[PDB]
Write a protein that binds this DNA or RNA. Structure first.
Lengths: 72, 243
RNA sequence: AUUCUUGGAUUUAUUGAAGACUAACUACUGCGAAAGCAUUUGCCAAGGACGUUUUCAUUAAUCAAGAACGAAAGUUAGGG
RNA sequence: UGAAUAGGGUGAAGCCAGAGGAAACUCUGGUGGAGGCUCGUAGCGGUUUGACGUGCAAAUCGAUCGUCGAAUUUGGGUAUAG
RNA sequence: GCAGUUGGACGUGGGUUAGUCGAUCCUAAGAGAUGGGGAAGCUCCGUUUCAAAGGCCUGAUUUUAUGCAGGCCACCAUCGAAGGGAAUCCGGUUAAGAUUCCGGAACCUGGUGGUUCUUCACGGUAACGUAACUGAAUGUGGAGACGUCGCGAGCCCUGGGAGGAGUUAUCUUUUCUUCUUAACAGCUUAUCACCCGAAUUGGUUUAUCCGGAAUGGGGUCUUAUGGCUGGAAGAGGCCAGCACCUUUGCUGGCUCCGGUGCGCUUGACGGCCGUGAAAAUCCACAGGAAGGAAUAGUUUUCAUGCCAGGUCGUACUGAUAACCGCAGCAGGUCUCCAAGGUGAACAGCCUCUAGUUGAUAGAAUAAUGUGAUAAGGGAAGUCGGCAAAAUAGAUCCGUAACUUCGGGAUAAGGAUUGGCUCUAAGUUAGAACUGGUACGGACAAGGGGAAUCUGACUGUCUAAUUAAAACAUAGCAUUGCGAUGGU
RNA sequence: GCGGGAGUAACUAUGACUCUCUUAAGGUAGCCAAAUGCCUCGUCAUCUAAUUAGUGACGCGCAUGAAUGGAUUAACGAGAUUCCCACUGUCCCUAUCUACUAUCUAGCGAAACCACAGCCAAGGGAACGGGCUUGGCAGAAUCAGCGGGGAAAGAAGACCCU
RNA sequence: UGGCUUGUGGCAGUCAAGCGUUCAUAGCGACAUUGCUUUUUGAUUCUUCGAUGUCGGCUCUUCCUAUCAUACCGAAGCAGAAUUCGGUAAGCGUUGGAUUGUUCACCCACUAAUAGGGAACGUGAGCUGGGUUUAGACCGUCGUGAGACAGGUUAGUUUUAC
């Protein structure tokens, strides 16, 4: 959206910041919590604090994969 | 006519690039048959991008000397591989997302990434980002198994394959589109192929047989069959249904 | 008649998979301010009515603007 | 794979405060971050006009005109030959 | 391209002294050497197990030493940087130059003197002392290791004191100018984290945070702009005094202090994604004693003596007479350093350190081709507003359709400056006064109103007559197509 | 890939609708005199000292038509027309002054480069004569100028055919 | 291109019956032709490929009158004057703008008023390069097609010293 600029028209350029926002801010970790946990690497949501691994599948903390096998 | 652009594929200058710079794109190494509590199984180390894939990967340690110096073991990136959780393997393994293990051990309708499909290949299907296949060929499919690969088509498999359970890491190529074309050209240097393209009708019938006419149109034909030569075979290769 | 069948259909049984809906119970029934709400079980969570009372003491009624909610059909992006 | 852009103007998103509003709108200031945001030099491009063509370069010279954190420019090494 | 006392032309010889500055290992682009085969050669393949390298045990020979052969050990395997991989300052002197010769002071590479823990023996013991024999870190796990981007808080002109001179011309000793200095070691600061943990609250602050201040278990620590201290007993320097053969040669001597950048400090922190490399050497290889205080050593560090440093490039030009346009041609040509005041910077303006006008010349200065000015007119002229004119800053007022709501605005329509005094004995803005052609006075610095098209946007382009509507573009769909694909 | 011939409504004037032939069978939403129109100064309004542009429509479509797509519709340009305001050496209208050279001189020293010859009017003619026929005319030493011929500086023409 | 003829044709003499109030000739002229001529408009390969480069205009270098206007004259079916017609005679004068590439086509404002014909239309080593011989790209129209067209559109070499 910042990087995007004038490229695209109404449906795309305006609306992608509304996808970026929920991918942004620094959240709690699954096992600690200072301000660290965002999109660290691409799809890999990291932790700079106590360094701790998450397990979901693709996006954030849980996708379709962990909703099946780490559930049943 | 001259040499067509599709013939310049086997060799070429545009068909060279960095090969050994690539640290190890995502196959799978030796990882223990057993799981008699496990031998060759350990934690994830680093998160590093190999060129070719266009997605993050990882390094892994097992029982063997793997942090830096020994250059091989690269581990398939699932959300969110990092230091301080274990991987497990073996035949009759524990079914979790982020564990590499057989297709036989998982039930029907499990999503899997970095999966083999021929008799051994280390890792074939769905190595980069977004991708995954769907194993649905057990139970009334009795002996020979079958991954139903994501379009619609076939593939007979014997015993065959291991692979990580899940959907893979990333998701920001279809999920998030790009912006411009020089930033798209970063694909066509980690892959060797000509880029971009000019129209077939705009090119002369000399350089590509889709040209012809003062008022430009398609000279020969757009639909050409499967059994054909080099310059002869272009366009839509066997247009089975039009529309 | 198009159509489907001797390249074995309809079908009968067995086995496996995918989605949607919940017959009967079902009513001259109940709930929700209206739109609306049908297998069974569990969790968070709301409202009405009754009963001896206890209790703050007009705190109330109504309300243009304004704010929030919206059957179906239609539109956008990703799935099925 | 190595080297290079001084100077100068704005600022969503995130987050807080203050007046105001049944509540929301509204509305006043601070904190702060993403730019083909944007601007002028390096690097770098070629619209107009006059003089040359037995002359300085085998397409030359003067006046005049463009871009610059982006699809950026450039050196070196190395490979591809009808 | 002339003269010519001149030249790289012409001819002859000399000068360039390194462990010290370059000439290496391993990772990338990328590539090489060797043998046999697969096969028609090319070539791919093998190197990955031996190889290569290292530890432990045994036998024969010889010596101041030594060196060799056999037996035993699985835990690793291709090649090449600019980014990764030794050391250094200052003066004398030269026809020329030294981190090179040389003078003075360093450092790297080998030959002489001093011991700390696991674990163990003997003696002694709160103790500590010593003889026998002591190679030594292919890792759990962490590092060397790489997209874009933002706010801090510190880092100057000038003065003070000392020496010297009052200007060809009216006149001038608190006027101007010169002088005003110095490797290293010791001393000892911002960031981080066992202040994780967290009661509390230093830090413009939103603050969970981290600190004055308080708590554990018994409690504290690293890195480091600057400053302070040592070296320097000594050395230089504004400027003068003598010898005196009057050619030429020496000898003596001053001041020393206060207001400030874009270096470095900050990958943390803030916050986004396209998701951040690989490796040899090397770090990594797990702390005990006294509460801490305090005190010592280390397969490490201190003390001390002698020799040797390989092997060449080394002159010098490097916008050039050495490179390079056949050329003594209006040329190509990597790339280093950064003062004053005026104007943002690196425009312009103009002086320093500092340098220089080329292989022909004089006098007049037609026609014609090369520069500016002006009455009146105001587009009337020419393929052709091409050419040429209006206007311009700072600060305040005032201002148009309609939106893919990211927009248009500097639309139009108007008004004023510098200087000096005063507001306040110290940003800047408000009051007040006069004049001229005019306050931006060199330099420098927007034309506006009204109607209309196409490619969405930025982007690619015909090398000696075609810069576009050609083609790309983020994005979207059908078809090949399960990859041992399609091609 | 997406038709012809014939007949037909008060009244000038037109064909809704109907019949017939032919072929595999004959087009919607929306728009028009085009980068495409023979016919056409078509036909009408406004503008202009005339004005066909500006801008207003007419219907008289040689030959418009939905996916290598109609259609909604904002921002941006060394790209394309006109009206309107101030105005302009482009011109009217040319003059004057200035820089440098021409004139003139020294030195050394180019360039591709070699037809006997060099008047005009009339006449014949290898066909447009200074050159051949008659007639009129034509002297030399020398320098500065200027674009008319011969047709320069040059390449075996650009049209054109093998 | 030049030559030739005057095809295609222009002009005049003019046969002069008609018709204009009577009335062959104020005027109008059936029907056409003879001589001249080279203008509408072309017949012909005679003479030409080691160049035969285009149009409208600017600028400057001629001659004739198939005559617009100025000197001189005569006549009418002409009242002065308006109107209508013919002879002697080439020294001179012969506009400004708008439509249109453009003279043609076509209109206006004046003014005393705004002619005819040839000459290498002076005419690209004086000048513009709009008109005018190749090369981006598109449409209509035609052919199995690469592509083409007696149809239109968009960009696309004026060198130098006589």
């Amino acid at each position: 959206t910042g990087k995007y600029g004038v490229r695209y028209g109404s449906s795309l350029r305006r609306q992608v910041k509304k996808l970026e926002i929920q991918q942004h801010a620094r959240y709690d970790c699954s096992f600690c919590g200072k301000k660290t946990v965002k999109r660290g690497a691409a799809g890999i949501w990291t932790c700079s604090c106590c360094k701790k691994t998450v397990a979901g599948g693709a996006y954030t903390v849980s996708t379709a994969a962990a909703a099946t096998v780490r559930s049943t | 006519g001259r040499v067509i652009r599709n013939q310049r594929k086997g060799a070429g200058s545009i068909f060279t690039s960095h090969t050994r710079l690539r640290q190890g794109a995502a196959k799978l190494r030796t990882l223990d048959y057993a799981e008699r509590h496990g031998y060759i199984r350990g934690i994830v180390k680093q998160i590093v991008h190999d060129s070719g894939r266009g997605a993050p990967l990882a390094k892994v340690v097992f029982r063997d000397p793997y942090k830096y110096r020994l250059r091989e073991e690269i581990f398939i990136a699932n959300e969110g591989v990092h230091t301080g959780q274990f991987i497990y393997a073996g035949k009759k393994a524990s079914l979790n997302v982020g564990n590499v293990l057989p297709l036989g051990s998982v039930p029907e309708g499990t999503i899997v990434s970095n999966v083999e499909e021929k008799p051994g290949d280390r890792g074939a299907l769905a190595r980069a980002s977004g991708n995954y296949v769907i194993i649905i060929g057990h139970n009334p499919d009795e002996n020979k198994t079958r991954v139903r690969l994501p379009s619609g088509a076939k593939k007979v498999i014997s015993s065959d394959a291991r692979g990580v359970i899940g959907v893979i890491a990333g998701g920001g190529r279809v999920d998030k589109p790009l912006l411009k074309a020089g930033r798209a050209f970063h694909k066509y240097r980690l892959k060797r192929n000509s880029w971009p393209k000019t129209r077939g009708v705009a090119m002369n019938p000399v350089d590509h047989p889709h040209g012809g006419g003062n008022h430009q149109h398609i000279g020969k034909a757009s639909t050409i069959s499967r059994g054909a030569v080099s310059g002869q075979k272009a366009g839509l290769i066997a247009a089975r249904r039009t529309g």
